[PDB]
Amino acid sequence: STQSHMFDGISLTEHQRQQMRDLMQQARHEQPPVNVSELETMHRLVTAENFDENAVRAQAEKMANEQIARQVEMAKVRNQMYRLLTPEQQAVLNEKHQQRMEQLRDVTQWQK
Amino acid sequence: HMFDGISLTEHQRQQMRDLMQQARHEQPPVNVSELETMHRLVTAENFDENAVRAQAEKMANEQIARQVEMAKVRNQMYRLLTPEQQAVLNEKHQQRMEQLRDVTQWQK
Ligand SMILES: [Zn+2]
Ligand SMILES: [Zn+2]
Ligand SMILES: [Zn+2]
Ligand SMILES: [Zn+2]
Ligand SMILES: [Zn+2]
Ligand SMILES: [Zn+2]
Ligand SMILES: [Zn+2]
Ligand SMILES: [Zn+2]
Ligand SMILES: [Zn+2]
């Protein structure tokens, strides 16, 4: 899923938005477009009378081992978008990120 | 989502919510560490494809365990259902599948 609102709280000259959106949808491209297949077999497994954990694990690992490519590509794009920014815009980015992290930890502790 | 369109006694509704909480228990927490080193990679002046790969995988593991535990519980819930309800679920499943398919050839 897109990082957007990734440039929330950030703006971001208009040519910067041009260069951004072009191509940020290339980051909407090579996102994860699921199969009716993955979904059908997943469904069959989940709906089964007795559960086959090893099967579902197998299917998960396949799916992931797949996505990894996309993951990497979209990471590349993201990095480009990042490089297209000013150290202060960046500052704000890294701040947003760090916030997000803290939130995640708070949630970890609460659910611990 | 997966029950979208099924109901469903209060007793069993609470069973399922109970199971849901205890599931947000048995499942792996978001490894904020890997997230750190990832953001860190993504924001470096020069980009290390292989490094990023290493991290992607290193996270993949938690991703998998999540999928498996989530399926474990979804299946527990399905078990809780009654024959009727399970059939309704099949209805919704097939509808969903239709929409999906009919769309996966659109516009073609
Ligand atoms: Zn089916
Ligand atoms: Zn299903
Ligand atoms: Zn696949
Ligand atoms: Zn906090
Ligand atoms: Zn605990
Ligand atoms: Zn950080
Ligand atoms: Zn990040
Ligand atoms: Zn990991
Ligand atoms: Zn387990």
Side-chain angles (χ1 to χ4, degrees):
Chain A
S1 50
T2 64
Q3 190 85 323
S4 286
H5 57 348
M6 166 187 172
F7 300 137
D8 204 44
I10 301 185
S11 44
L12 205 60
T13 102
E14 191 57 6
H15 210 99
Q16 217 178 192
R17 181 73 187 189
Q18 161 192 344
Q19 276 190 139
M20 230 44 160
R21 298 197 327 267
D22 306 43
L23 305 312
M24 179 186 54
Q25 63 274 324
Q26 170 58 16
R28 211 77 64 263
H29 168 61
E30 300 175 47
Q31 282 256 6
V34 201
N35 312 26
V36 336
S37 172
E38 293 171 357
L39 290 174
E40 260 300 331
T41 94
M42 204 23 108
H43 185 90
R44 317 270 179 60
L45 293 175
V46 164
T47 59
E49 301 81 0
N50 55 12
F51 193 63
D52 187 333
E53 179 177 350
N54 297 345
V56 13
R57 209 186 289 98
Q59 162 95 344
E61 176 171 48
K62 177 175 180 176
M63 288 170 40
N65 288 153
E66 294 176 5
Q67 312 301 167
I68 272 55
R70 302 177 186 76
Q71 260 75 34
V72 178
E73 227 101 299
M74 208 181 166
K76 171 201 293 179
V77 166
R78 290 184 180 192
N79 162 78
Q80 307 199 193
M81 283 146 58
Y82 188 86
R83 193 58 185 105
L84 293 166
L85 288 162
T86 95
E88 301 159 26
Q89 299 186 111
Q90 289 175 10
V92 184
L93 183 152
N94 307 294
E95 190 186 335
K96 291 295 174 191
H97 154 77
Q98 297 162 38
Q99 302 190 347
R100 147 202 195 174
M101 309 284 82
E102 170 60 13
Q103 263 80 61
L104 286 182
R105 300 206 190 89
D106 295 17
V107 170
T108 200
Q109 286 299 344
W110 204 80
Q111 270 296 124
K112 178 185 180 172
Chain B
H1 72 317
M2 161 181 155
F3 285 128
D4 283 340
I6 284 190
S7 184
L8 213 152
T9 122
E10 174 71 359
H11 201 289
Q12 56 181 198
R13 196 172 301 166
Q14 269 163 347
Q15 305 180 238
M16 292 182 185
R17 275 196 256 109
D18 161 288
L19 262 53
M20 276 290 309
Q21 175 190 126
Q22 70 89 15
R24 308 189 298 256
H25 209 217
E26 210 225 87
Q27 78 158 25
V30 161
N31 189 334
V32 58
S33 171
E34 310 195 291
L35 256 25
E36 299 286 22
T37 123
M38 179 56 167
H39 183 57
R40 192 169 59 82
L41 287 211
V42 185
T43 66
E45 233 96 359
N46 48 11
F47 199 53
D48 205 321
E49 280 191 309
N50 332 114
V52 170
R53 176 165 316 266
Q55 199 68 188
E57 208 74 32
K58 209 184 289 184
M59 306 158 66
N61 167 265
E62 286 91 2
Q63 181 173 29
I64 301 165
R66 226 166 261 105
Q67 265 190 275
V68 170
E69 299 292 339
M70 278 311 113
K72 189 155 174 287
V73 62
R74 306 237 311 274
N75 179 258
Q76 310 262 230
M77 299 182 178
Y78 168 82
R79 293 315 307 118
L80 297 195
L81 288 183
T82 59
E84 300 189 337
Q85 302 180 304
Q86 288 169 353
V88 184
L89 200 168
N90 195 327
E91 286 189 347
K92 317 307 176 187
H93 161 43
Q94 288 296 168
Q95 292 179 191
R96 198 173 315 113
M97 296 316 295
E98 178 171 24
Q99 301 314 265
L100 180 59
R101 276 168 253 252
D102 277 29
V103 157
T104 49
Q105 259 174 328
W106 243 242
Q107 199 159 329
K108 186 189 64 63

